[PDB]
């Protein structure tokens, strides 16, 4: 089911995590790491779906950063208006 390799992912999460813990590495439940990764993947896949609809809407089939950028701004409006 998982698409990102867990190791590189957990190194990243650890790097980010340490900024908040005074240079001390908090340990993580294995299930906290999986929860985090599943959630990040769900997020990126959703963003890709949204972005791609814009691609198809532009008349394209190739996804560009501008499509992603634009899907972020639209999620932001959804979140802000609704």
């Amino acid at each position: 089911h998982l698409l990102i390799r867990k190791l590189p992912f957990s190194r990243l999460a650890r790097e980010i995590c340490v900024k908040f813990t005074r240079g001390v590495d908090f340990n993580w439940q294995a299930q906290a790491l999986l929860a985090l990764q599943e959630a990040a993947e769900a997020f990126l896949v959703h963003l890709f779906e949204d972005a791609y609809l814009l691609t198809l809407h532009a008349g394209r089939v190739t996804l560009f950063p501008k499509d992603v950028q634009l899907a972020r701004r639209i999620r932001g409006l959804e979140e802000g208006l609704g």
């Binding site: 990102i4 980010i16 896949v45 190739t62 560009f64 950063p65």
Partner: protein, 74 residues
Amino acid sequence: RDNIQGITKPAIRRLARRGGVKRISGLIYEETRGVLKVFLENVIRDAVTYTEHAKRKTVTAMDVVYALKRQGRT
């Protein structure tokens, strides 16, 4: 930031496929990496500070869930 670069191109491609994306610019890789960092920063911050709030030293799945609910609302 040698670690975000550890998130590989094939991983990014699989994620995009899962999203229904047939093709990508090569520029999509960094774009995606940058988006992932911002996501993980928001969520991890809430997760750990919650663990700390509870006077614990181990981040649990329930801590992550609290953070997802927070970022959800927001």
